[PDB]
Structure formats: C-alpha cells, structure tokens
RNA sequence: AAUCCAUUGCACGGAU
RNA sequence: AAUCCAUUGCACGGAU
RNA sequence: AAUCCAUUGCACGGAU
C-alpha cells in the first residue's frame, strides 16, 4: 500500500540472516530517520524475508522508506512499502 | 541511452505491471502522486510500445522532482516503478 | 553505509561498459544533482562493476543515491551506497 | 472480459 | 545449530 | 582490439 503509516513494510530481505541480527542491523539504519517503537521479525514460513518497523512519527516512516527504498542489503535491494494497516502498538 | 536526469515538469515510469488496466493503473497514479503537487494529466496507452509505461505531468517542476527522488523503485503491483524526467516537454505543457 | 556522504559507491556496474563511456554516462546521469569534483572508476579485478562519484555538496549524493537507487544502466539494476569512507579529495 | 505467445517500450502486436 | 529442498510471503514448512 | 574463464568487488586476474 501506497499510504502513508507509521509501520514500514519490508520484504525482498536475504533470509539467511537470523531474528537478532535483522533486528540489530535494521535499527541501525533506521533509526536515523526518527524513534524507532519495535521491530517485528519472524522467521516462519510465511514471515521470512519480511520485516515490520513502527516509527512513533509518520513523519520519519515517510522519509525511512523513501531514502532506504531498494537500498542492497545483506545483497538484495530493500522492498518497502508502507504498512497495509497500523501496527497494534499504533491502534492502542 | 542514460536514465533521463534532467528535471522535467512530466516523469517517465516504465517497468509497469502489464496486468493492471489504463483505467486502474491512472487511477492507482493518481493516488500515489497527488502528495507532490498538482497533476495536470497521466498519460497512459496499452499498444505493444505502450504498454508497461506512463507520463505523470506535474504542474511545477518541483514536484516532478519530489516524485522522482521519493517514488523510485516503489513496488507497485510487485514490481519496482522505474522513473526518470521525460526526455521532452508533454503537449499541454509546450503551450 | 547507509550515512550520508559526498561520495556515494555504485557497483553491479555492466561490467563490457569500458572506462570512458562508464565514466562519460555516470557524468551525464549524475551531474544533474549537483556539481561532481570526480569520478573514480577502475577495471582491475577487484575494481570493475563499480564507481565512486564524488559531489561538491552532500544533499546531491543523496538526491542522486534516492533517485537513481535501482535504476536499470546498461541492463543492469545499479546498487548505490554512500562510501564507508571519505573520498582522500575531500578529507 | 479471461488464459497464452511476444514486448522494458519516451509518448501526447499475435493466438484460443 | 548446520546442511540441502521449498517459500517474495502484510504481520502482531519439509529432510538428515 | 575482439572473445572466453573467473570476479558482486569500498577505492583513491588468467586465457586465444
Ligand atoms: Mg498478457
């Protein structure tokens, strides 16, 4: 989805790098942008190569997906499209 | 030929899913480009050298330009848009 | 990288691109973002399929990095970075 | 309309 | 854990 | 010069 969320939405991402690096690399490149709130990684079949980032601020999701869209990462450009709905952190 | 970088009030998108429809893929532009500026008009046809391709004609250059830096390699119906300015000046712009 | 930089590092270049036209068409590309001080481009082993353009300014590399970031060259999807580290031109 | 073949194309095609 | 097979997937698998 | 093999490499090869 094209609209602008807090969450970016990530796939196209190498799925030999495991839960606690993905998470540690992806908050160091992001958190340039503004404050990151979580990270959702999961490595199950449906769930890999695929990553959830919930910035506080629309604002820094915004700029986030716009400056690191198809950036090569572990040798594959960055998918990233802005969430299809809010995050539950968001919704409460 | 180079990816066109010279600023252009029209952007050039290519690498377009063929599957999606003049009508939806127009309307779906629309939706996407509208935060830039003002668009005049998208040009869109579905002939064998047409197809996979659109002209979005921004009223400032400006904008064009936000479009471009902020929409490139979007995955678009799974496929990254390609973008780059139009080589040439779009008709209702010349005039 | 992914900091902001003069001097950005493009690599999955065409790799049958020869020196002076790689380096004449990454001008002609580039050059519209701001002003480029060089463009280093070698064929040694280690080197070819890559470029380092470095700019006079740094909102131009990264107009340059966002706008061009996967754009196909010579049937190839061009991979862009920000140098790890400062151009010696600029240090 | 749909399925298939072909098309990456800078403008203001073919098959069932 | 690892290895191989499969998976491009919008969320809060299979084999040694 | 051309072509083949290898190389996805962060800088300031082999072969006919
Ligand atoms: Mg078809």
Do not use: C
């Amino acid at each position: 989805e094209t609209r602008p969320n807090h969450t970016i939405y990530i796939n196209n991402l190498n799925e030999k790098i495991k839960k606690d690096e993905l998470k540690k690399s992806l908050h160091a490149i992001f958190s340039r942008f503004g404050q990151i709130l979580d990270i959702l990684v999961s490595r199950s079949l449906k769930m890999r190569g695929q990553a959830w980032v919930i910035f506080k601020e629309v604002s820094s999701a915004t700029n986030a997906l716009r400056s690191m869209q198809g950036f090569p990462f572990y040798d594959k450009p960055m998918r990233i499209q802005y969430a299809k709905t809010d995050s539950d952190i968001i919704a409460k």
